Scaffold this active site. Structure first.
Site, short mmCIF file in Angstrom:
data_model
loop_
_atom_site.label_atom_id
_atom_site.label_comp_id
_atom_site.label_asym_id
_atom_site.label_seq_id
_atom_site.Cartn_x
_atom_site.Cartn_y
_atom_site.Cartn_z
N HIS A 5 0.81 -1.22 0.00
CA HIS A 5 0.00 0.00 0.00
C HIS A 5 0.85 1.27 0.00
O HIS A 5 0.27 2.36 -0.11
CB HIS A 5 -1.09 0.03 1.08
CG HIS A 5 -0.58 0.21 2.46
ND1 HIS A 5 -0.79 -0.76 3.43
CD2 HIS A 5 0.01 1.28 3.04
CE1 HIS A 5 -0.27 -0.26 4.54
NE2 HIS A 5 0.22 0.96 4.35
N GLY A 8 2.68 6.38 9.46
CA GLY A 8 4.10 6.29 9.21
C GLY A 8 4.74 5.03 9.80
O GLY A 8 5.89 4.73 9.47
N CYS A 10 3.66 1.86 9.34
CA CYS A 10 3.52 0.68 8.49
C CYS A 10 4.88 0.22 7.97
O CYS A 10 5.78 1.05 7.81
CB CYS A 10 2.52 0.92 7.37
SG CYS A 10 0.80 0.98 7.93
C1 LIG Z 1 0.25 2.43 8.80
C2 LIG Z 1 0.85 3.47 7.89
O1 LIG Z 1 1.95 3.95 8.12
N1 LIG Z 1 0.15 3.83 6.79
C3 LIG Z 1 0.86 4.45 5.65
C4 LIG Z 1 0.15 5.71 5.20
N2 LIG Z 1 -1.25 5.39 4.87
C5 LIG Z 1 -1.93 6.53 4.24
C6 LIG Z 1 -2.18 6.31 2.75
N3 LIG Z 1 -2.68 4.96 2.47
C7 LIG Z 1 -3.96 4.63 2.60
O2 LIG Z 1 -4.82 5.41 3.00
C8 LIG Z 1 -4.31 3.22 2.19
C9 LIG Z 1 -4.60 2.98 0.87
C10 LIG Z 1 -4.88 1.70 0.43
C11 LIG Z 1 -4.89 0.64 1.29
C12 LIG Z 1 -4.60 0.83 2.66
C13 LIG Z 1 -4.54 -0.26 3.56
C14 LIG Z 1 -4.19 -0.07 4.86
C15 LIG Z 1 -3.90 1.20 5.33
C16 LIG Z 1 -3.96 2.28 4.50
C17 LIG Z 1 -4.30 2.14 3.13
C18 LIG Z 1 -1.94 4.92 6.08
C19 LIG Z 1 -1.29 3.63 6.58
#
Ligand SMILES: *CC(=O)N1CCN(CCNC(=O)c2cccc3ccccc23)CC1
Ligand SMILES: *CC(=O)N1CCN(CCNC(=O)c2cccc3ccccc23)CC1
Lengths: 304, 304
Positions: free
Chosen positions: A41, A143, A145
């Site tokens: 993602h 941030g 993930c």
């Molecule tokens: C946990 C973390 O650090 N994240 C990275 C930044 N995203 C923000 C952008 N991504 C999303 O909103 C997004 C898009 C598609 C699928 C997913 C699945 C899980 C989490 C976010 C997702 C938040 C998460």
């Protein structure tokens, strides 16, 4: 003596953390040999959160779009591929700090340490358990993930988890290092609700043995039980059924303390039925289930 | 979101751990620059436990009697001196992994991470607090003496504790890195009993703010209180008195949540008087006091 919720020393894993940016998204990557592993993602915008088609989104990404930074030094991406829900970014430099490692897929009830990271930088380390509903109760902000969960066997790091998401209930979901989610979760911002978060019975029993070893003995009683009788009470209290395999695993703790496993089950049965009455066990007012029998032996024997 | 008892990443401190043997005694040492710091009781036998005269015992020790091993490599001891309750062993090689560091003496209520070690090898990391009675509740077996407690400010490790002993009640005592014991404890196997282990009120309030930030809000009530009224209840429950300094320190958390500090005190007052009624706050059935307001801000903001 004394018994603490202890994480493995994190140095070997700190040496593997890198920052991965794709477009406007920055998260963490795990650099082992010449490959950087990260949640797929990273390629998504907030727009693509509802229904991402990862194969389609990935077509618009080239090696130069994945910015990988290790400390203040940029890594050169020479290949990229998607494996389940992780991306594997091949870099031109093997991580010089790569420890001996394995990728393992853990079972519910198993514990591990998480090195929480932001922008490729470690912020802290804590001990988790894979819950019976395949969620973990972590501490993850935006941030984080790509932060990983692991166990260490002397000098070998067994990576078991990579953080991908937070459910609307505040619990966490992620994958093993082959990119397969634990449980039924998907990397999509959709209605995903966790099932029953049952208590890991074998871990509570292990922690009761740790309590006895460390001097907290008030809960020991004059009773015994059978697996079947115990399990009728366990079902009633949303505890995992105890199996003969769990009894066998608790064997060494039973030998060390001289308390038969079924006698400890009878102590647990009375604690479930009667509560703690305002008392504590190892500084806890609830029955702790995030120590496996192996964790208790490890901590009580002083394994390095 | 999610809130965990988190330790600092331990890699910088793992790089400092060495084994120190004197005669039949083996414990841990901390190698910073060309000095190895360790408890002076490394020079004692079990015989010398009742009334050790450290100056006299040290006369029989030469540089070659202190065996210092870093990994599988022996270090050459070129000087030794006693500073309070620690020995400083000057070695001929500066530790190449010496991080930026400080020696600090913490106050009761302050938290830190401990890297538990055996034979110079790290076994685990956990978060502690210096209790108001100057003990810590750790996890230390024989061979863990010389393990250290620390905090990290970005890249600077502030060492605040070195483990020396376990009281007959299972609680732990040790020194700062200048060798001065926290509290009234001495490195002698004698009758040493700890005073009242009061609850660190400002830390419980900080943890209640962390709970609100992370969604656990059931304990919020319609009341307020004053410092004086709150403190009458705090005294009754063996809680540390809350000062205006503690209120000021909680200011940023109060601003973030919009809950005035005295309103949170009134929530805490009702929790003390009424108990939890079988409910939990951040997965705990008791009021947690081993998170400082700084720890809560750090964890809730994602400091690396
Ligand atoms: C946990 C973390 O650090 N994240 C990275 C930044 N995203 C923000 C952008 N991504 C999303 O909103 C997004 C898009 C598609 C699928 C997913 C699945 C899980 C989490 C976010 C997702 C938040 C998460
Ligand atoms: C915590 C730890 O690793 N220890 C090192 C090994 N000793 C055993 C031998 N030393 C003593 O019995 C001894 C002698 C004098 C003074 C003290 C003070 C505190 C603890 C032990 C002491 C046990 C501790």
């Amino acid at each position: 003596s004394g018994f603490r919720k202890m994480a493995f020393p994190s140095g070997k894993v700190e040496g593997c953390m890198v920052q991965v940016t794709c477009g406007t998204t920055t998260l963490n990557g795990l650099w082992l040999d010449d490959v950087v592993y990260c949640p797929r993602h990273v390629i998504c915008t907030s727009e693509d959160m509802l229904n991402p088609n990862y194969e389609d989104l990935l077509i618009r990404k080239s090696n130069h779009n994945f910015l990988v930074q290790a400390g203040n030094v940029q890594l050169r991406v020479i290949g990229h591929s998607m494996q389940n829900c992780v991306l594997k970014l091949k870099v031109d430099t093997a991580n010089p700090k790569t420890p001996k490692y394995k990728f393992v897929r853990i079972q519910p009830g198993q514990t591990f340490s998480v090195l929480a990271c932001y922008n490729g930088s470690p912020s802290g380390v804590y001990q988790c358990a894979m819950r019976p509903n395949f969620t973990i109760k972590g501490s993850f902000l935006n941030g984080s993930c790509g932060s990983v969960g692991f166990n260490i066997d002397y000098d070998c790091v067994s990576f078991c988890y990579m953080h991908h998401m937070e459910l609307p209930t505040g619990v966490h979901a992620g994958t093993d290092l082959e990119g397969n989610f634990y449980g039924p979760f998907v990397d999509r911002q959709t209605a995903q609700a966790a099932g029953t978060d049952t208590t890991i019975t074998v871990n509570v029993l292990a922690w009761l043995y740790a309590a006895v070893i460390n001097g907290d003995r008030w809960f020991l009683n004059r009773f015994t039980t059978t697996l079947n009788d115990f399990n009728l009470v366990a079902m009633k209290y949303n505890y995992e059924p105890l199996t003969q395999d769990h009894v066998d695993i608790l064997g060494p703790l039973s030998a060390q303390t001289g308390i038969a496993v079924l006698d400890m089950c009878a102590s647990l049965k009375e604690l479930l039925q009667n509560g703690m009455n305002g008392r504590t066990i190892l500084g806890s007012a609830l029955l702790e289930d995030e120590f496996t029998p192996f964790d208790v032996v490890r901590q009580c024997s002083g394994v390095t």
